[PDB]
Symmetry: D2
Subunit: 242 residues, 4 copies
């Protein structure tokens, strides 16, 4: 997270950390609890190539990464079939836990948005995670969960920004309809935040609008963070999650 | 170049090295002289974002990088407008030199193929460059230009290979019509070879079949190197480079 | 610490971590509380060149580095004047804290040995710290304090070991009288353990026999870790520490 | 070499490069040809632990490192027995080549100094090598041999400088009698120059005054480069090297 602050303990109870087996269970992506037994995350975190499930673990919200670990094995990994690379979309995946987790005030699910919510510019939204605090600048120990408020940029405006300073033709769409843009040169997600949530407050309720997907650098001018637009994949999600 | 050998001085007179201004003019990509004043390379070597030409130089055929450099400035860069990322194709670009270079047996152009050449499996082809000799293994000094013969794999066969062991649905095309696959787990190009040429001996003549574009690792089982298919963009090329 | 285990919460209440001002207060060396207001460490951890005290802090016994830090400023650093490089000895230094710490069962001093104790081979001894778990392998988060039992090797036997396979003449002493050897190819200290304690259980009492000083690699065959022999410097220590 | 320039091809014909086997024959220290079959270098480059001679090679003077290699195997490595670590001195070693090399204008020996030469401050001396051009800044390809004029600092003055800003007692000698100090905050040797020569011109003749040994940083204030004083080891050298 670039430009943010450490999260209050009572915030983002749905945040999760994905760990890969490497000398220790190392954090590599975020995710969100969307059902007591299901984690929502980015396809690019667990694909396109099929991985051995023995090498992955999920960690539920912790104020400080690695300090109070209670690792949870995954029973199944479901990656959207249209996914191959982030720039072409469908960057979304589901992790079914071996067992449903206990639901409390400190650890619980985030609500998915109704199909009609477009999250237009002006919406108050935050992205959270334990990623780098700037380009090539890792979050220092004790690794607090961070948050940052990021402004939403309408898709067409964002698509135009991506063409600014690039050879790509205007008629060539960079930002797709299954994507959403948020952030600016001072507020954005960074390496390690991928797969985590972008939540917006709508009439007093938190709804997950996006999944951290890709970008052209952390908090880089004219290159807002790109997220997978959750509403676009509700039908697919509902095919697996109760 | 993975699994190859140092190229003989008289081979590949069209090979070029692209340099970026660093603590020295550091090699970062290959290219090929397709006309006395035009270098063909990959778009990803110079885009999709526009870069300051002041930070780029072209070096013509040399046996060892950096030893006897005679760097050339680039007048202009033309990147195919359909290019954004390597996996969606159109990974091709043209660099116009300030003046036409002097053609000799030592340095000269490579012929482009006629639109009908498909370069099917079995065709003898070589990829050349100063790229890594293996994953995370940079070419050692004195940096000789290397070459390696790479086996061609038909597009659909290759597309099926890329779906092996992946979540990606079969209805999702990974290898596109403007791409070509060559290489195996023993012979392939690697980091730093991008933009360079894949050339095939067709009935006694050397034709450039591809431009090193991408892949999923260097000489990795069931993931051959992917090249931009030159015949696909002949008309685009001929829009800028004189016939 | 190479080849050890995480230390139990109630063990080594004298262990301390030395921190240098970086993107965070990063651990760089160990030390031991030998008096409520004095920390014993290795000179090479703080010299031979004089450094700005503002860039240094002491952290008392904690189970996991960085998690619950309560950093302490150092009022004064006293480095043995005979120190220049580890291989010529006198690798010992004292840090005076600004205030005497609160002694408890969880945090208290370690006893220094009487001058006559030689700590001969066979003596049960442990080295503790947050150093690498192997050559070029840093301690993984959450950075637990580790411990390992290390075999003592008599000085001359050790000095002969250090000449094995070397051009160095036998008349050249490598292991000095103010040094002590401990460790083998399975158990030893490693980068980041320097300055910490080697403590031995002598007839029911824990005595600090050495200070981690140097060696030729971590847990390397025929090259035991070298420690500054505490008894050798008792008078020097007692010139400053009550 | 910090603060220097590329050496003219005609200078330092005695400079050699020591190479260790690692993916390629990689440079790791300098040396000087003091006899057609003997190379003088630093003990720390080839010790204190005995190394397999098959992993070492010597390269005679090359204007550009790695470009025209003609590697020479070593027949024997003789390290001073008093050597253990650089700060305690005796940092000197001899390499006997399998065969004597051809002597020419471009490649030949450097003269050792007479026992009486102390090389006081003011003497014009240069250190040469292919080492880093600054702290953590490697020599960029094509790796030219560099040189730099370094001022000599009298031993006592140098020893006092080393105690400046340090806890070490004044009565504790840091700079020993078998050492010699040269350099300042703008001119010095650096990582990779170790083992190479410090040569001074005395009445129109080049004499090797020192072997690059150690120091605290490349061109660091009050920490001049430290060299093994060759005159101190003439008897030892003469025990192995003829004439
Ligand atoms: C999830 O919440 C459950 C309900 O509180 C926990 O089970 C309960 O564990 C208590 C002690 O942690 C125990 O007093 C309760 O009797 C027991 N109740 C039931 C219905 O199981 C559960 O803790 C786990 O399960 C218990 C039985 C032990 O095996 C513990 O070691 C487990 O932590 C909570 N943790 C989960 C399910 O992840
Ligand atoms: C040392 O000097 C000799 C005289 O220059 C070298 O021999 C000469 O090598 C020439 C090719 O390098 C060759 O055309 C000359 O006929 C030959 N002359 C003589 C007197 O032999 C010698 O080169 C080595 O030995 C010769 C015989 C060949 O085997 C070469 O390949 C060798 O390099 C020089 N030695 C070295 C190690 O350079």
């Amino acid at each position: 997270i670039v430009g943010g602050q450490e999260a209050p303990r009572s915030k983002w109870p749905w945040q999760v950390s994905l760990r890969v087996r490497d000398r220790y269970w190392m954090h590599f992506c975020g995710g969100s609890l969307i059902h007591p037994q299901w984690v929502l995350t980015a396809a690019h975190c667990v694909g396109p190539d099929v991985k051995d499930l023995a090498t992955l673990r999920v960690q539920l919200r912790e104020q400080h990464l690695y300090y109070q670990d209670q690792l949870l094995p995954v029973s199944r990994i479901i990656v959207h079939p249209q996914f191959y690379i982030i720039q072409t979309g469908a960057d979304i995946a589901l992790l079914e836990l071996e067992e449903p987790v206990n639901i409390s005030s400190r650890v619980h699910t985030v609500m998915l948005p109704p199909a009609s919510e477009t999250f237009p510019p002006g919406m108050p939204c935050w992205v959270t995670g334990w990623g780098d605090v700037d380009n090539d600048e890792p979050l220092p120990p004790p690794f607090p969960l961070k948050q940052v408020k990021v402004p939403i940029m309408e898709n067409h405006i964002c698509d135009a920004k991506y063409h600014l300073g690039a050879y790509t033709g205007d008629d060539v769409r960079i930002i797709r309809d299954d994507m959403l843009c948020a952030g600016n040169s001072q507020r954005d997600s960074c390496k390690g935040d991928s797969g985590g949530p972008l939540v917006c407050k709508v009439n007093g309720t938190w709804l997950q609008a996006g999944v951290v997907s890709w970008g052209e650098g952390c908090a880089q001018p004219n290159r807002p963070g790109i997220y997978t637009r959750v509403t676009y994949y509700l039908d697919w999600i509902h095919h697996y999650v109760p």
